[PDB]
């Protein structure tokens, strides 16, 4: 089982959108996948997956033995092969213990999940550290913006102070080729020259993403959305298939 953390440092770059679209895309490809919300007291994954109302037991409930993995897992109704483990809603920093999280991950491998997508919260503190700790891969989610690139670099410093190493990938999100050519936005290449890691995807700015979270329907399910198609390309690249980068030229 491949444990993939979706991280960033900077808040509001597209971690949740990406964790959702990618977990769905992998499920569509017939790979049994679970996406876990690692947030502390803020439930945003269930809102984007559209299952905010089916949340009975959460990640912390399973760790403290108040519920089984079967009781807390929410099987997606729209896509076959997809499951969601939602976040706790306590203002509590601890809760998510290292031993606890490890026990949950082993149970999930035992349930034959191929992909365990960890939707990390913002920051460098507790929840974020816990989501990357057991990762095999990290998807560093970034915008062509100064705060986001600075905070992604801080996150790479934390992922690297671990010296099989965490395989790192850059997911450049909310890209706008037109803005890049008018000289108003950092280009894909500018971002790679700074955060020197392998590009795994480029998600264009798309008006389909607001419409997708409005409905609680991950953007990959909208077959006409450019952001959806770029997420399907990302999923291909995660499965080992080379794909040319679309939506980088106008």
């Amino acid at each position: 089982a491949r444990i993939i953390v979706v991280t960033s440092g900077k808040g509001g770059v597209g971690k949740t959108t990406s964790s959702a679209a990618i977990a769905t895309g992998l499920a569509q490809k017939g790979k049994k996948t679970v996406v876990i919300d690692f947030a502390i007291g803020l439930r945003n994954l269930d809102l984007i997956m559209g299952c905010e109302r089916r949340v009975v037991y959460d990640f912390v409930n399973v760790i403290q033995g108040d519920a089984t993995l079967n009781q807390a897992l929410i099987k997606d109704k729209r896509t076959e092969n997809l499951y969601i483990l939602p976040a706790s809603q306590t203002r509590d920093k601890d809760a998510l213990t290292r031993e606890g999280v490890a026990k949950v991950l082993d149970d999930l491998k035992a349930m034959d999940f191929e992909f365990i997508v960890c939707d990390s919260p913002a920051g460098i503190e507790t929840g974020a550290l816990m989501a990357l700790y057991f990762a095999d891969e990290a998807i560093i989610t970034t915008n062509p913006e100064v705060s986001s690139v600075r905070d992604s670099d801080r996150i790479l410093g934390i992922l690297a102070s671990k010296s099989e190493p965490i395989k790192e990938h850059l997911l450049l999100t909310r890209y706008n080729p037109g803005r890049v050519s008018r000289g108003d936005m950092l280009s894909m290449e500018d971002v790679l020259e700074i955060l020197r890691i392998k590009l795994v995807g480029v998600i264009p700015e798309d008006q389909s993403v607001l419409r997708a979270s409005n409905q609680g329907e991950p953007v990959i399910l909208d077959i006409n959305a450019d952001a959806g198609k770029a997420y399907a390309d990302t999923v291909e690249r995660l499965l080992g298939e080379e794909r040319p980068f679309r939506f980088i030229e106008e």
Partner: protein, 70 residues
Amino acid sequence: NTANIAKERLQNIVAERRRSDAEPHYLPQLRKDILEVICKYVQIDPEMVTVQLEQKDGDISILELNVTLP
């Protein structure tokens, strides 16, 4: 053209971030403590008063610091 300004501002910090892990935990603490202190006796803000660490092919270091006075 603000993409170019963004790129330069970014490199100078992530070079800064790349650097902090090479230094010890005290050497940069002391420099900030005392070199900036020569403010009372000199008085300039950086505005670059540069700091660059180097090394030799013999497990030796070279902390050089430029003081560009206007």
